[PDB]
Design a protein around this ligand. Structure first.
Ligand SMILES: Nc1ncnc2c1ncn2[C@@H]1O[C@H](COP(=O)(O)OP(=O)(O)OP(=O)(O)O)[C@@H](O)[C@H]1O
Ligand SMILES: Nc1ncnc2c1ncn2[C@@H]1O[C@H](COP(=O)(O)OP(=O)(O)OP(=O)(O)O)[C@@H](O)[C@H]1O
Ligand SMILES: Cn1c(=O)c2c(ncn2C)n(C)c1=O
Ligand SMILES: [Ca+2]
Ligand SMILES: [Zn+2]
Ligand SMILES: [Zn+2]
Lengths: 544, 145, 48
């Protein structure tokens, strides 16, 4: 009992389809370091996001493929976390310590920047303008040195912006680079995006990815550094070995002699060697991919706003919008708002169209009543020309309730009384009421749809097994059957840890089952995952 | 404590009229609908404060002339000369009054900033008056549902 | 109501076979059973 209780956390079990059609159970070992890195909370957040996008956003057909991609990405991220955990060489090691500190404290810098922006805006609240010397914009308050305090706050804010930029560059970009290299390698190995096929003209990313085809450092940040050789051996006969070599930037004789025997080079002694070791085309492609990231562009905008705030102190008020991306519920409510942004802009365009039609008819017939001047001898009409009539309607009639007719003169006492009444009533009902009703309903329906999405994801996960797909009703025949099955038999963490265990274990040490699973991982065949069957289902007659 | 204070001043007993909210069950149901998203509502009004503040900054920087709220020309009473009074003016008047902040402001026509003031007023009307109160309404409706 | 109509149509098509009417659960006993059945065995284009 004591041994089992001690090795319970380390003992992990999974189920596979197996070479024979009978479902089989595999027991392996889970490392303590692996479990700790898995229980890292960022891993939990990534798992939640992956589950949400694999349930709500479809992808059931490619469920196992997405799961395997998620496992690979998480392994890469936790390797990064392990690395960044707590003369020329001296400066280099000091630099790596600084970068590691920034990587570990990246989020705290973001929160500190938000607080700094709040403080700067609070100080700017006390501004005033005058004509006499302190026009003049001055910070007026009783206690002095407040302007020096604001200067110090601004300097600290920009220094923190630098730290956030460096932390993002050193923490988040490698995952994006890894994903892009993996996608490119898969495309040019299996689908042959560039061999026996050509990217489309609309594929801007496809055209941009053509740069790293010949660069020597193409397989950087990705487990496989032999993708070029594999593609050569796969498409050499059809496309031509020389053509493949020219496309991929390889040397046949060089690779052959390295396959036979190679020597060991010397480590870079100084900085000039690193300078000459820069691959310009690969770096340009890396810049091209990194600058397309939305978060990097937002951080650059933050930094540019801080630099402009140095020029003019009021530019720091733009950083108050950072709460929208900092606080999560801000993101939720603005996701509700932006879920139908195209709907809203198209609605306001339709509003512009109908208001334009009302301007045309009012210009044609209702010109007299648009006098907006109290002096009769100096009339100021706002519908004499089409431009001013359209501007008047847009600016005044839409904003003011009751339609356009409120600003217009009294229709009574003329021959067009009924026509003007119909005009005003139609404007009020079609512009003021119906269109703003659409505006309200779009937002309300967005809230409802997002709530329904979260509820659907939660219900689906609570009802169905993720790996097998069998409903909870079959397992709940036995007490706590579903709880046992989704925690002991088929566990996402268990499959992840088995993948890591296969990666770590030597090839000659793999047992029959481990080798049988391994071959398939490499051949990208997802048949070991038990879909529609389980150990209990197979051995119900034998009582498991 | 409210009853004891009502002994001191008779009008303090009016606070006991809110006891119906906790006495009548359907009062509790409707106020549960109201308070189911209380954090949502307070965070929405905070966001309203933030955006109104940004509009105050831009109006102070450029639209200072048009905020004269005095009928006497010889005694002008501007409400955006300083940041505090401009923010207070926007918060108190523009949010409550329909049609955006531009209704109280002077006529943009006849100046070089006509288009800029038109864009300012239209953006204020669409983002503050319409969208945010739409969120306020939708939160309560979704809570009932 | 319109959003519910679109969602209902999508869910019905994703769940039930159009020609047979048998639910996807019976076919999904075998891996990719529904995907095989709605693309190889009973296909609207095939009947056309
Ligand atoms: N094969 C499976 N592996 C894991 N969970 C499964 C599986 N099949 C179904 N589930 C369901 O997925 C649900 C997800 O819960 P989970 O264990 O991830 O919670 P948690 O660890 O508390 O979450 P969080 O990510 O918020 O920390 C489980 O409650 C379980 O019912
Ligand atoms: N007998 C059937 N024939 C065809 N589809 C069926 C049948 N029974 C059920 N279905 C379902 O109908 C769905 C309709 O998808 P379909 O194959 O028409 O997509 P598509 O060709 O991508 O669509 P689109 O018309 O937008 O180009 C399928 O995904 C399938 O699950
Ligand atoms: C299949 N596979 C991986 O998925 C992998 C890996 N190293 C890291 N990962 C994620 N190796 C060596 C591997 O063979
Ligand atoms: Ca062996
Ligand atoms: Zn299962
Ligand atoms: Zn069928």
């Amino acid at each position: 009992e004591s041994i089992l209780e001690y090795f319970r956390p380390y003992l992990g079990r999974i189920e596979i389809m197996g070479a024979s059609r009978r479902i089989e159970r595999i027991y392996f070992e889970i490392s303590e370091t692996n479990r700790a890195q898995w229980e890292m909370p960022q891993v939990k957040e990534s798992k939640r996001q992956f589950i949400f996008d694999v349930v709500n956003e479809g992808g059931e057909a490619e469920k196992m493929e997405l799961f395997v991609s998620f496992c690979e990405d998480t392994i890469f991220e936790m390797q990064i976390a392990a690395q960044i955990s707590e003369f020329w060489g001296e400066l280099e090691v000091q630099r790596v310590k600084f970068l590691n500190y920034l990587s570990r404290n990246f989020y705290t810098l973001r929160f500190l920047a938000l607080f700094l922006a709040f403080a700067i805006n609070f100080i700017l609240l006390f501004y005033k303008v005058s004509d006499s010397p302190p026009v003049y914009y001055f910070l007026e308050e009783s206690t002095g040195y407040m302007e020096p305090a604001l200067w110090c706050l601004s300097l600290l804010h920009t220094l923190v912006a630098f730290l956030c930029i460096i932390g993002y560059n050193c923490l988040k970009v490698p995952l994006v680079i890894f994903k892009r290299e993996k996608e490119l390698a898969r495309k040019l190995e299996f689908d042959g995006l560039y061999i026996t096929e050509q990217p489309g003209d609309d594929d801007v990313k496809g055209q941009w990815d053509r740069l790293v085809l010949n660069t020597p450092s193409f397989p950087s940040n990705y487990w496989d550094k032999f993708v070029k050789r594999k593609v050569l051996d796969k498409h050499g006969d059809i496309f031509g070995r020389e053509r493949i070599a020219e496309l991929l930037g390889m040397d046949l004789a060089s690779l052959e002699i390295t396959a036979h025997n190679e020597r060991k080079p010397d480590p870079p002694p100084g900085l000039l060697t690193w300078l000459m070791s820069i691959d310009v085309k690969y770096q340009i492609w890396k810049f091209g991919v990194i600058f397309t990231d939305n978060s990097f562009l937002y951080l650059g905008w933050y930094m540019v706003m801080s630099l402009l705030g140095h020029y003019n102190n009021f530019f720091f008020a733009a950083h108050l919008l950072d709460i929208a991306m900092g606080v999560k519920t801000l993101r939720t409510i603005l996701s509700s708002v932006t879920h139908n942004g195209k709907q809203l802009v198209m609605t306001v365009g339709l509003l512009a169209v109908v208001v334009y039609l009302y301007t045309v008819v009012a210009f044609n017939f209702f010109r007299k009543f648009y006098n907006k001047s109290e002096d009769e001898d100096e009339p100021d009409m706002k519908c004499d020309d089409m431009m001013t009539c359209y501007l008047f309607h847009m600016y005044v009639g839409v904003r003011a309730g009751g339609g356009i007719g409120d600003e217009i003169e009294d229709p009574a006492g003329d021959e067009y009384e009924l026509y003007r009444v119909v005009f005003d009533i139609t404007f009020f009902f079609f512009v003021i009421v119906i269109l703003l009703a659409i505006i309200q309903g779009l937002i309300i329906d967005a809230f409802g749809e997002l709530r329904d999405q979260q509820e659907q994801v939660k219900e689906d996960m609570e009802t169905k097994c993720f790996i097998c797909g069998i409903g909870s009703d079959y397992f709940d025949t036995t007490p706590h059957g579903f709880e046992t099955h989704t925690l002991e038999e088929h566990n996402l963490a268990n499959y992840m840890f088995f993948l890591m265990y296969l990666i770590n274990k030597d090839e000659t040490e793999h047992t029959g089952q481990e080798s049988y699973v391994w071959k398939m991982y490499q051949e990208r065949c997802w048949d070991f995952f038990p879909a529609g069957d389980c150990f209990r289902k197979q051995y119900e007659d034998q009582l498991s």
